[PDB]
C-alpha cells in the first residue's frame, strides 16, 4: 500500500463519526494488507461499505489484474446503522523498506 485517501477526513490524527476505530489504527491495519498485482506497476483501489458490521478485505472494488490474498483481514467495525467509509487506496510496486518522509 502506498497512500490512502479516506473521504471525510482532514488528517490522520482525527476521528470519524460512525466507526469504533481511530484513523491511525485503520491505516496501520492497512500497512499489513497484502495484495497481488500483475499487469501494472501502480493501481488505485476503492472500497465502499455501509451497514453495521466488520469491514473485511472483501469490500474493495476488485479488478482482474489486482488480487487480494487474505479475504478475512479485518480493517474496522462500523457501529452505526447508517454510516460508511469510502477511501481510495493507492498501491504500487517497490523493493525494500521506504518510510514516508524520505520521498520527494
Amino acid at each position: 500500500v502506498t497512500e490512502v485517501e479516506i473521504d471525510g477526513v482532514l488528517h490522520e490524527y482525527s476521528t470519524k463519526e460512525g466507526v469504533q476505530e481511530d484513523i491511525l489504527e485503520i491505516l496501520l491495519n492497512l500497512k499489513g494488507l497484502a495484495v497481488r498485482v500483475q499487469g501494472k506497476d501502480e493501481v488505485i483501489l476503492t472500497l465502499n461499505k455501509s451497514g453495521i458490521g466488520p469491514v473485511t478485505a472483501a469490500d474493495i472494488t476488485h479488478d482482474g489484474d489486482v488480487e487480494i490474498v487474505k479475504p478475512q483481514h479485518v480493517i474496522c467495525h462500523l457501529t452505526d446503522e447508517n454510516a460508511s467509509i469510502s477511501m481510495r487506496i493507492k498501491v504500487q510496486r517497490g523493493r525494500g523498506y521506504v518510510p514516508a518522509s524520505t520521498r520527494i
Binding site: 482525527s14 476521528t15 463519526e17 466507526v19 469504533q20 467495525h77 457501529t79 452505526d80
Partner: protein, 100 residues
C-alpha cells in the same frame, strides 16, 4: 501488555483516572470512537430519573510534557459491563492493565 507482570497493574491502571471506568453495571448500547453509550441495568437504575450513561472520551490533547494523551474503546457492542470496570484504554493502558 507486559508478560512478566507483578499483579499491581490493575490497581494502578484503575486508580489513575486516565482511563474511563463504568460507574454502574450495564449493557453497551452504542460504541463510537468518540463517545460511548451505556444502557443502565434496572437494579442500579434509580427509580426516579431512569436515564442512561454517556461517557465522552478524551481525544488527542497536549500533556504537561508535550505528549499525546488519548483514550481508546476496548469494549464491543451488545455487551454486559460491570460497575467499576474499565471501558477506555487511556494512554499506556491496555484492557485495564498498565503497560508502559
Amino acid at each position: 501488555k507486559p508478560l512478566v507482570g507483578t499483579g499491581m497493574e490493575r490497581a494502578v491502571a484503575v486508580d489513575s483516572g486516565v482511563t474511563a471506568v463504568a460507574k454502574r453495571g450495564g449493557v453497551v448500547q452504542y460504541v463510537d470512537a468518540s463517545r460511548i453509550v451505556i444502557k443502565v441495568n434496572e437494579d442500579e437504575m434509580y427509580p426516579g430519573e431512569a436515564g442512561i450513561d454517556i461517557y465522552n472520551l478524551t481525544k488527542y490533547t497536549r500533556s504537561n510534557q508535550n505528549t499525546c494523551i488519548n483514550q481508546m474503546p476496548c469494549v464491543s457492542l451488545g455487551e454486559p459491563v460491570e460497575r467499576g470496570d474499565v471501558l477506555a484504554d487511556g494512554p499506556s493502558t491496555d484492557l485495564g492493565e498498565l503497560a508502559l
